[PDB]
């Protein structure tokens, strides 16, 4: 009746916390909003914060990306940190300011 996968989809969201995708939505993970389909307990939660992960850097360890700059899923953000999701890169707090001054 509810056009879900007769056994799998049912059990998956019926007992677990596995989020159902009932009305609404438009943002995607590659393919447009799912009308009746399902998404994992991680997909939902992580939708509100895609890539939003703070990657701490040790002192005396500069970077490989200057502030606001598009990153690749796995691209070495820094010479001591390997990011695990795409998006843009952002800084936090300054410790060094090297730049041409006449």
């Amino acid at each position: 009746l509810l056009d879900l996968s007769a056994t799998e989809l049912e059990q998956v969201l019926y007992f677990s916390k596995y989020i159902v995708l009932d009305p609404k939505g438009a943002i995607l993970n590659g393919v447009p909003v799912e009308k009746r389909q399902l998404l994992t307990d991680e997909e939902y939660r992580e939708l509100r914060y895609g890539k939003q992960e703070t990657y701490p850097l040790p002192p005396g360890v500069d970077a490989l990306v200057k502030d606001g700059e598009e990153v690749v899923k796995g691209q070495e953000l820094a010479p001591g940190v390997v990011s695990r999701l795409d998006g843009v890169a952002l800084y936090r707090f300054p410790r060094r300011v090297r730049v041409e001054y006449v």
Partner: protein, 171 residues
């Protein structure tokens, strides 16, 4: 190029790749006095951030005019800044950053979403037995054997709920 070691207990109101000449303070420490002033002319850079954090936000720079405030889900097209030349491409909280002179929006949505049986119940309520009947009534004939066996067993179910008086929400 003189680096000038800036301690973390000092504020810095300078974006990456900014413009500074011998009169504009760069590292404007929370504490006054001794704080560095503009050393000569040129641009400015920022090295060794303690944290490099990525975000599924998108970058929309501006030179002037900040209309869209902070925290509002902006739809793909709604003017963010620059009078009208800067528009979002996705929903989500808009975090204005006057420091870096750029407004960004974290790609997020107000997706409704449940778990367990209350998840299914409401979806059962929303199921219109009427429209689905016609939809499948066509889905049974026009399509081939692939979708035929599907609509075959599928239609009889709803049809059974119609000539009953018991809505499928009662399950």
């Amino acid at each position: 190029p003189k680096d000038y070691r800036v301690q973390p207990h000092m504020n810095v109101v300078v974006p990456e790749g900014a413009r500074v000449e011998a009169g504009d303070k760069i590292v404007a420490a929370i504490d006054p006095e001794e704080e560095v002033i503009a050393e000569a002319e040129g641009v400015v850079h920022l090295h060794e951030p303690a944290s490099i954090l990525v975000v599924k936000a998108r970058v929309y720079p501006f030179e002037d005019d900040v209309e869209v405030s902070t925290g509002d889900r902006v739809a793909p097209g709604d003017v963010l800044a620059d009078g009208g030349k800067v528009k979002s491409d996705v929903y989500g909280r808009v975090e204005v950053d006057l420091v870096r002179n750029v407004v960004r929006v974290v790609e997020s949505y107000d997706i409704d979403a449940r778990m367990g049986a209350e998840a299914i119940q409401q979806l059962l309520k929303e199921l219109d037995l009427e429209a689905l009947e016609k939809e499948l009534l066509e889905e049974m004939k026009h399509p081939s054997r692939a979708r035929r066996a599907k609509a075959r067993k599928r239609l009889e179910v709803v049809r059974a709920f119609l000539d009953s008086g018991n809505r499928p929400e009662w399950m």
